[PDB]
Design a protein around this ligand. Structure first.
Ligand SMILES: CNCc1ccc2c(c1)c1ccc(Br)cc1n2CC(F)(F)F
Ligand SMILES: [Zn+2]
Length: 197
């Protein structure tokens, strides 16, 4: 009923990385290591780095899925709100109900799980470009955390899984997400609250 969120590096040493984008009022995506939390504007590019210590086999894939963070909501499928699922903003590949999209990857596949009804987006895993030490996937979040009838102010986590060609688990990592109008201010506010507590 609930996908695992346990961090698991696995045989290949899989883990995520994030850029250091700062907290200026104009920032569109920013990651807080102290909160393990990404703050981003609606439908803006969120770069997520994929790091491994050793090379996984051909056919390895990378899946992203959102779940509610609070235990009393974990069994509810995270989906776009009644407004955004109808707003005709599809990219030609993502179903309009899906919160998480991958940008700029024609091999992205979108799954509606036939048993759990949860949504996810999966891409073939690829090595870095020549000159780079990690692979970057660009995600978009297609509703605000506040959207009524959707996330409705409830915090979510994104779970990133490294999978073999059958979908078996090779590695797992995760981070909280807030989709909001002013990620820089909200990151500063939440980090201050953490320090005060
Ligand atoms: C030192 N490691 C460089 C590196 C980084 C990331 C790498 C790879 C190598 C690599 C090699 C083959 C395949 Br298939 C995917 C690969 N990825 C992406 C991910 F998601 F698996 F991490
Ligand atoms: Zn919405």
């Amino acid at each position: 009923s609930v996908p695992s969120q346990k961090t698991y590096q696995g045989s290949y040493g899989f883990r995520l990385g994030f850029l250091h984008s700062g907290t200026a009022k104009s920032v569109t995506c920013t990651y807080s290591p102290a909160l393990n939390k990404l703050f981003c504007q609606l439908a803006k590019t969120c770069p997520v780095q994929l790091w491994v210590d050793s090379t996984p086999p051909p056919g390895t894939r990378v899946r992203a899925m959102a779940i509610y963070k609070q235990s009393q909501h974990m069994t509810e499928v995270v989906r776009r709100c009644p407004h955004h699922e109808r707003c005709s903003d599809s990219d030609g590949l993502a179903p309009p109900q899906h919160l998480i999209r991958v940008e700029g990857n024609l091999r992205a596949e979108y799954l509606d799980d036939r048993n759990t009804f949860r949504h996810s987006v999966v891409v073939p895993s690829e090595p870095p470009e020549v000159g780079s030490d990690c692979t970057t996937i660009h995600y978009n979040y297609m509703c605000y955390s506040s959207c009524m009838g959707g996330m409705n102010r409830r915090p979510i986590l994104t779970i990133i899984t490294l999978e073999d060609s059958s979908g078996n688990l090779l590695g797992r990592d995760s981070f909280e997400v807030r989709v909001c109008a002013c990620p820089g201010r909200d990151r500063r506010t939440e980090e201050e609250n953490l320090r005060k507590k």
